[PDB]
Paper text:
The CsiD protein belongs to the non-haem Fe(II)-dependent oxygenase family (protein family PF08943), but the native substrate(s) of the predicted enzyme and its role during stationary phase of E. coli remained unknown. We purified CsiD and demonstrated by NMR and LC-MS that it indeed hydroxylates GA to 2-hydroxyglutarate, while the co-substrate αKG is converted to succinate (SA) (and CO2), as is common for this enzyme class. The biological tetrameric form of CsiD is generated by the symmetry of the crystallographic lattice, as it was previously the case in structures lacking the by then unknown substrate. The enzyme protomer adopts a distorted jelly-roll fold composed of a β-sheet core flanked by α-helices, as previously described.
In order to shed more light on this interesting finding, we solved the atomic structure of CsiD in complex with its substrate (GA), its product (SA) as well as in complex with the αKG-analog N-oxalylglycine (NOG) as inhibitor, by X-ray crystallography. Ligand-bound CsiD structures revealed two binding sites located at opposite sides of the Fe2+ ion. The co-substrate site (here termed site II) is seen in crystal structures in this work occupied by (a) the non-processable αKG-analogue NOG (where atom C3 is substituted by nitrogen compared to αKG) or (b) the co-product SA. SA is bound to Fe2+ via a terminal carboxyl group in a bidentate fashion and further interacts with Arg309 through a low-occupancy solvent molecule that occupies the site that is generated by decarboxylation of αKG to SA, mimicking the interaction to the NOG oxygen in that complex. Importantly, in structures with site I or II occupied, always the cognate ligand for the respective site was observed with the other site unoccupied. Conformational changes in the CsiD protein were not observed in any of the complexed structures, independently of whether ligand site I or site II was occupied.
Author numbering:
A (entry chain A), B (entry chain A), C (entry chain A), D (entry chain A): 16 to 142, 149 to 218, 223 to 324
Amino acid sequence: QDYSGFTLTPSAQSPRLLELTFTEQTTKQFLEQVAEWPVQALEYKSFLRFRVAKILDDLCANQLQPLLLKTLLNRAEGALLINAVGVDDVKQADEMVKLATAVAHLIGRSNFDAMSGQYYARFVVKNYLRQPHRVMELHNDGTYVEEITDYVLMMKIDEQNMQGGNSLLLHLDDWEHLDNYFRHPLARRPMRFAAPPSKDVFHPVFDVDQQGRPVMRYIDQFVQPKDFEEGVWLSELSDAIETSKGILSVPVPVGKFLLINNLFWLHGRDRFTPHPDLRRELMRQRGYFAYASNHYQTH
Amino acid sequence: QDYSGFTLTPSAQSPRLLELTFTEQTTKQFLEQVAEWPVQALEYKSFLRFRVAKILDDLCANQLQPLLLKTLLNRAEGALLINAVGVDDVKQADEMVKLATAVAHLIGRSNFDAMSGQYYARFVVKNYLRQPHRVMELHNDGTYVEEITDYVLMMKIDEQNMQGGNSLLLHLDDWEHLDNYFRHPLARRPMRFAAPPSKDVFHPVFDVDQQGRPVMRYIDQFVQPKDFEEGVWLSELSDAIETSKGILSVPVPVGKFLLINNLFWLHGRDRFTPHPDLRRELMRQRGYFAYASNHYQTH
Amino acid sequence: QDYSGFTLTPSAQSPRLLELTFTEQTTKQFLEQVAEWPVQALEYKSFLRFRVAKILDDLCANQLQPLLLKTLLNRAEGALLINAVGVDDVKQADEMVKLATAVAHLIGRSNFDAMSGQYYARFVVKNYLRQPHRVMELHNDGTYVEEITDYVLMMKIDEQNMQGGNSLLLHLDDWEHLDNYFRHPLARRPMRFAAPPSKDVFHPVFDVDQQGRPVMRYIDQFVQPKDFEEGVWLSELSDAIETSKGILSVPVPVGKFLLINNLFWLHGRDRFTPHPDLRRELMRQRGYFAYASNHYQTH
Amino acid sequence: QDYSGFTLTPSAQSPRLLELTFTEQTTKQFLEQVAEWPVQALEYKSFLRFRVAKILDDLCANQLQPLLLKTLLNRAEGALLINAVGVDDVKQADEMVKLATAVAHLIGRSNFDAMSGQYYARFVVKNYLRQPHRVMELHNDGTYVEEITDYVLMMKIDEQNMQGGNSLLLHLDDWEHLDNYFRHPLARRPMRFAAPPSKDVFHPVFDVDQQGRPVMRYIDQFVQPKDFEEGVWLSELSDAIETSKGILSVPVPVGKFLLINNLFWLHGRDRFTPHPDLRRELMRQRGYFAYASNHYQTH
Ligand SMILES: [Fe+2]
Ligand SMILES: [Fe+2]
Ligand SMILES: [Fe+2]
Ligand SMILES: [Fe+2]
């Protein structure tokens, strides 16, 4: 299991989460070969996101794309942590954005992001939610729209005078309370979802895949229980997730990013220590799967 | 008729309006048990409104919820005034918001409020409508949307150098002119309703419940008569309400709130005395009923 | 033809345009009887527009409403100029608004006005369109919405150091070129209409009434010809209207207003002389007809 | 091939692009005959755009309109460059706008332009896209709306301390790679298109005319490939256009404008030299064809 242009190894936290590192040579060739397109050009022309994607897959002998797809579609795995040797300082923020864009567009397409107005977003924490000193709860993304979100991506840009603040993760077949909530009649009841500042949507909190196994579509801030029966059941569901013993805690140094299957993984973030001269900065992307396979058709 | 955790007694104004007071011990236990969620957290996660609701009902031995439901659904009653010993100064505004949220979410759910952007709203009067020195006319809430609003809630936050300004109320089976307006062909004619700064709606001013008795959906500022036949009839309807001898006048001290069935009760507010150093502050919520019962179903 | 509370006489400009004047006594009784509702209250509660309407019709022994209706629906007439003795200075602007509101709501209802945000609008000219020194072209109102506008109302509020600026009017059975444009196949072709800052509408420039006679729906600023065939025909139509010999020129002193049938009359405004200390001010309303009559119905 | 009021000659760049020049006499008569309508009046009343169009065609003995139509609808030609003797300085900007409006409205109608809020737009470059020092890529206009855009118009207003910056053009039957991309199954696959700051649209990148020949609807900034199959194919399509040997390079002096068939021509712009005192200014319009012809009809 040795690949062309990168190395792949299980993480220190779980065998379901794989670490993928691009070599110093692959890194410096990719940055040379995309130096003519600044970050502003990727924002303007979306076919260029698939072009820098092909450039990176070609530099890895067309082994990157089927590997990313097999890993993200395998019920037993479904998640990755990614970096490139030599890209690791806040003064290299532009190079970091280019690298994350190429990986996403081998597996599908990244959707528009309302908070930045682009296909990605950057934000700073001092002294999503930028509230220091508290934990961010585990959730799926994309629950408040009709089309399914298949994947989520998150990258670290700067860090100064900083203690704490790791990322958190949870897989459904590691969640000890799945069968109890899935066999409840409310697991198959469609419910309402809504975000703060368009239209509301209706779907169950659980569904099944093609073989009959469970998948989830949940976040505490945006689900809207219609009555006391739904609302109590959901607050019990929230506690059963946040106190799960299956949660992973992952540091993300300046230069690295996570990428996960959004149907059977959830994610979040830990609290940190205050300091008068503290600084932290992040970047994110989200989207759907699209790929080739052999199946029936007519005419 | 002695209950666990609270006392219940008819008001000095009418036997249709009941006063419900939480003991100093229930109050201090509820504030301790919800101290980890500040008001900002209830704004962010709506299942937490049903959680603080369950916490309060459990502290009353599951006697609060069937009592609130029986009272609000009984055609003969339908209204309540509520407070908690020890919570009574403008410096305790945050504690007041928490208490009102728990009561509402035992009977149904509170709807989004466009003037504050949250599920509740706070406003100040000096020197809805903040016009001093004039009366606010009796009405139902929610007339300018399609779904029915089943209940209304209103709470007092501060008061300084203040004379006057009580709340006003009216029940349909106490209104001496009901039969005259209900048997008119215009009582069953659908009419247009519209608010100031979306879409208009069409419904009659009167309807019936399941037994055939009358209910109302009326406010003077937002109904829009289409011709001289409808417009004269409505201005006669307005005078017949504002001069009714069945109206109740209720002071609401710092710390107390009203909660009423919006289908067969109407509500309003009295005028007050000017003073250079005067100050008054309020809070409100509105929503629909949802509960369990035995009835037919298929498949 | 002597009426209770007012006098009625043909104008100096045409027998199709009648002048209606309320006596000093009717004026001072109406202003007393509506003094408890300031202009701000008519803005807030629309049934009060039909109430001040009934108050004025009652002061005229229920002769005003059938007279206004017979006049506006008669193909041979269709227009009025209205005033009240003693109301004639810029310091009485509020009294003027009250009078015009009562007349309109005996015949139908005035529609929302987007430029002021109320059911009426006021504007000032110095040194619709506030361009001094040029003529405003003849048109119908309401061409860019789906529902028909049956009437138009316009009132004068102030005037200082001012020469020129009369109102202009034209009736279709006085227009020498009607038959030529009505028998053209393009008279019955639906066309597109659009305003500057929602949705566009499609209707012919001409139609017929129930007997088969012609009516119009035209304005130069908002009709949008789709091709050279429609566009040339419309610019010829515009010249044939602006140079018509049937146009009337009407001064409107501080305190008076016009009110006309919008289906077979058009209206506009003349140019004026500049002066460093010049000032002029106006008010308008628009709406549809609604009234009782004997006709067939089922069930 | 000598015409009344203007001269017509093939350009120095291609026989598919014809140059049309109005004489000094036609120019000074047109400016006199439209001097009563300033640019502000053409903005307000759209039938006046067809009026100044008829005025110009009449000054050319009704030979301009069938010539413009025959040229733009002929698959072998389809493009023009236009000017008027004596109109050539930034102080004559208003006269330039009037001339371009008259030509467009003989062949069809110019659509609303969102960046200026009028039927045309003006913009300045210093030191669409105003980025100095880089090339603007070849494209069709109107790809992100449902109705077809048949033509495009572009005019030069000022130029100071300026080196470089010509216009660029490409005809499909001059494009060496047409057959290769047209016979691909993706040429007939409907795809999604979207602009930055309403609704998205779906159409193939290629279609056919009534005889079965190819036409195009493409721009790199607004097409949105749905997967890696579409996205790679489009980035190959972009390179095959930008490096085509069939591209024309056209200077456009102060006072001249281009006008082209948008179904089988594409267009763009070259880079230029920096200078502390540099200045350049432009104007544009776009729309659809509408004209008379002999064909079948019913009833
Ligand atoms: Fe997230
Ligand atoms: Fe209310
Ligand atoms: Fe008008
Ligand atoms: Fe363009």
